[PDB]
Design a protein around this ligand. Structure first.
Ligand code: ATP
Ligand code: MG
Ligand code: MG
Length: 356
């Protein structure tokens, strides 16, 4: 049992994803993504050990035949996924980086003397870190896992294998109140001009929280407009909208296609429809009613209707979202919305481990 991510943080939170180079994990087909985790000796979960990119079917090297069944097993790259922590918690950020670098050195020894064997649950030499194995039905192998012996690889990490995910209070997006919020608001798809635009459209309206409504409107409208732009650009089938009806040839497999996710740069990871909950029933109605013409003044009726309905019925920006994250008082929790930095920017590089 790999522990689930904590969902609540007092303020902004950060998680990291780190794909390793130099080895693979092989596991039975249709196995769970998580096969273990690393915790501090104190018991705090630091990161998960996961399979990531499928690298083809696993073939046990004949020189390592052990009478064991490896039928239908698949090879994957290994990705280290941190348990989120508070963005300003220096010790927690540092312990995650150090534990990942330690595990990479441990993997370097593992492929040298225990190639094509599962990782064992052990404690680090200095006693700082502990490996827990949740799926023993795995093997770790050097390189691409075809040869019985390694090429003496050092297990490494690189910016191209790294992402960071930032979680903030949903009510904060558009307020520019913190450096994290300002970094998120710098996303090219976010149109800050929409805040003042909403205020102009709703003067005769007596809104419960006009500034919160304007922020929600700018956030949702920016996402809806960007989705329509990407659907047109990449020829994506959204709801009932057919790109071929507008003479657009598909050039992506959908919203989850890595090139589509890369085009967001700062990728929303939370279901857009969740944000409506931060407003009163009345204010939410006013925000939603005003989004439709923003799409319709820029996109065809069919694309506008389909994007609007898609997000209204709880559609996700790019597959399964992180929709249960909260911020503030643990007792009266507030919605947190998450964002994935496809490439780690200079502002967040200090959160990522660097191979020495
Ligand atoms: N509350 C949180 N605050 C900040 N980061 C978080 C939070 N919860 C999870 N994360 C981070 O989110 C990332 C994992 O996202 P997720 O669990 O959705 O994976 P995934 O489903 O495989 O991703 P994807 O849908 O992009 O393929 C990690 O970096 C993790 O630390
Ligand atoms: Mg991941
Ligand atoms: Mg990622």
């Amino acid at each position: 049992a790999t522990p689930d991510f904590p969902t609540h943080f007092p303020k902004s939170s950060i998680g990291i994803e780190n794909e390793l180079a130099g080895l693979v994990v092989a596991m039975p087909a249709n196995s769970a993504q998580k096969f273990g985790y690393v915790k501090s000796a104190q018991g705090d979960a630091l990161f998960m050990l996961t399979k990531d990119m499928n690298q083809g079917s696993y073939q046990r090297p004949p020189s390592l035949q052990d009478g064991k069944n490896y039928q239908n097993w698949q090879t994957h790259t290994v990705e280290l996924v941190s348990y989120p922590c508070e963005m300003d918690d220096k010790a927690a950020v540092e312990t995650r980086k150090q534990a990942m670098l330690w595990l990479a050195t441990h993997f370097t020894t593992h492929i040298d003397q225990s190639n094509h064997q599962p990782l064992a649950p052990i404690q680090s030499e200095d006693g700082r870190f502990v490996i827990e194995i949740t799926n023993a039905k795995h093997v770790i192998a050097a390189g691409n896992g075809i040869s019985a012996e390694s090429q003496g690889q050092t297990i490494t990490m690189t910016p191209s294998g790294q992402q960071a995910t930032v979680g903030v209070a949903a009510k904060g997006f558009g307020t520019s109140a913190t450096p994290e919020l300002r970094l998120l608001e710098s996303a090219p798809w976010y149109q800050k001009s929409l805040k003042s635009q909403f205020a102009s459209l709703t003067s005769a309206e007596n809104l419960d929280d006009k500034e919160l409504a304007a922020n929600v409107f700018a956030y949702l409208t920016s996402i809806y407009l960007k989705t329509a732009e990407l659907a047109k650009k990449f020829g994506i089938y959204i709801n009932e909208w057919d790109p071929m009806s507008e003479q657009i040839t598909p050039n992506a497999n959908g919203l989850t296609d890595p090139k589509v996710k890369n085009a967001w740069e700062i990728l929303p990871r939370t279901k857009p429809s969740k944000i409506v909950e931060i407003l009163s029933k009345s204010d939410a109605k006013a925000v939603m009613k005003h989004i439709k013409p923003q799409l319709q003044s820029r996109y065809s009726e069919s694309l506008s209707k389909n994007v609007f309905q898609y997000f209204q019925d709880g559609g996700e920006v790019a597959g399964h979202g992180i929709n249960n994250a909260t911020v503030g008082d643990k007792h009266s929790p507030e919605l947190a919305i998450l964002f994935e930095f496809r490439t780690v920017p200079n502002e967040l590089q200090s959160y990522l481990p660097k191979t020495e």
